[PDB]
Design a protein around this nucleic acid. Sequence first.
DNA 1: GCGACTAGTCGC
DNA 2: GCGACTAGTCGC
Lengths: 226, 226, 226
Amino acid sequence: MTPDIILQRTGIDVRAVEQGDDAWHKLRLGVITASEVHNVIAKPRSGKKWPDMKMSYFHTLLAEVCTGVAPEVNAKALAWGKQYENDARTLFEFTSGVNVTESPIIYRDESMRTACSPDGLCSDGNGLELKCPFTSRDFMKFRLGGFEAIKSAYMAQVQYSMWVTRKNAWYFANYDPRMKREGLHYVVIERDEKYMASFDEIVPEFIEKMDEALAEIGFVFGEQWR
Amino acid sequence: MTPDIILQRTGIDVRAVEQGDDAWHKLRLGVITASEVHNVIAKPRSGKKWPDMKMSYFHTLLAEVCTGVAPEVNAKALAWGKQYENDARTLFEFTSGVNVTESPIIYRDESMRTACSPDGLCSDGNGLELKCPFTSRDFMKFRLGGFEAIKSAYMAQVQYSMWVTRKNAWYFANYDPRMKREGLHYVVIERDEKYMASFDEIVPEFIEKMDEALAEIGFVFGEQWR
Amino acid sequence: MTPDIILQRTGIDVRAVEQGDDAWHKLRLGVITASEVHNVIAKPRSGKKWPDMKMSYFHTLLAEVCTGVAPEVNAKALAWGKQYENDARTLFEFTSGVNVTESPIIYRDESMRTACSPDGLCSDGNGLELKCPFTSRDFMKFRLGGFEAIKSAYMAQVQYSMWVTRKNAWYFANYDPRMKREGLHYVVIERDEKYMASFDEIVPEFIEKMDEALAEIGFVFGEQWR
DNA sequence: GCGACTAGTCGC
DNA sequence: GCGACTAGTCGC
Ligand SMILES: [Ca+2]
Ligand SMILES: [Ca+2]
Ligand SMILES: [Ca+2]
Ligand SMILES: [Cl-]
Ligand SMILES: [Cl-]
């Protein structure tokens, strides 16, 4: 990929874009993102039937393609994550001693069907995921249990981000500015090939199924971007 | 069953009412309605103890009788629906096509225990459920899957409205204006006699049980219209 | 275990303290409270692995300890309960013919790890849990269903209140201002010695684990009061 | 069946 | 990033 090829497809220039703004949102329309991918790998306890949460994501992205919008979602907890992200980053850099470079959005391949938005790329070649949990209760869960107690959704997110960027390891850092002390804690998550194999199998399928579904109703992927 | 009988029981004039008046809500108080009947017909896995969803609608309805006060409208979904209500109506008229005349509320019999408030009545004898889903996701679920796609709750709602109104078929419509094109989808649902029978045995019991409960606390159905 | 034992640790005059004010909340940080205690007595279906809720409540208190804050929970229900506080109480004394004294907070022992904040203390020596349920539906559930319909989380709360205050009986009441009549219902729950033991086996272990956890990260219980 | 736990589900 | 519901599972 290049910031050039993205222009052809979407008319948008990516070099002058901020995590959050208008153009950022449009870039993600219809695209399987690391933040939502837990839904794509969700399995039924029996059968081969896609569970509701996976169907709902399926129809969510299809709507994104056919309407060219996404619904605006504000929640207290998300706004908090956004408010404290910058401070988490700086604290993280000071403590780990690495430099972080902010990354717009990264697609896996020419198809542009798969992407992550890293919280940064580090000077040592690892990617970075920051959490600023809205509840101090969740911060504590991670501060004590470490790797053990990363939410599966967060794992799929990190793993997918390696899957997309081809990277080998990823920082996962949790920050709480209400902690008197010990308000930063991070681990390194190694690329895991069970996940990689899972995405190789499951993601191409999910994309095929979305193609078949849009054809039935006379749309084509990419319409969100005209 | 007529505007006279309703005036005599509730002192309300039905012709003065639109979908959403302070009177629209008053007329529904304590009445088993279409949109809520799925709770009425919920069965346990085994046995005959009423499931939680059924108790919880039971106590909801009883509370309406004894307080005379109504459930909070989710303002967000309704402001949406009210805003495109008319466009959907006209589009479906133009489309199907048929003439859609408004129905405020329809009770099944003089007991006034059972009612629907259809989104209209149609010239060719069909009723009409016409929704503008708050999420395009839901529009897509239905647009692609047809009716097998949708509810436990929607089928029950529609059949119930045929039960109440004696009618033989119903249009189930969705309108999404955010759709770039073909944002109206619809099916015709035929009166299913196995549902009709289900209502005929389950709903009366349910009503006997509310009358038992009201007497236990010295209330009488109808008090909510004083 | 006296009024002054408190001032030495916290610097708080328990006189001034009116349920809701600044001082009230400070006194509850990191302390196992009756409303939450059902999370503490939870047991997993199979192994030993403390259930979600238990772990969740575990982490909530630790964070109270290390942040010295607790976020606002509910608010909706709580603001409703505030508004009807006096009337529920007046109606209750009228009806039961006992007099209600408001207690701010009550610790079980000088360890100060365990507390309840009863809605009152009665002239007959019983305590008083006095709820104004957010929905009339829940009022109705308790009105028709009595003792047996009130949940596990409520019984636990009440029993813990006896466990804390060393009392043999407790009034469990609901008030609903919206009910035309019959707006107040109440029962008497007696001390249950199996609950007492359950609290005796389980609680001190749960406290012992909190202390292990806090050490782990260089925090000490007591710290939040500074 | 019962009922406390457990795992989604989806709104905000 | 929750958080209020609720459909499901499992040991009596
Ligand atoms: Ca992040
Ligand atoms: Ca409707
Ligand atoms: Ca209380
Ligand atoms: Cl939130
Ligand atoms: Cl003691």
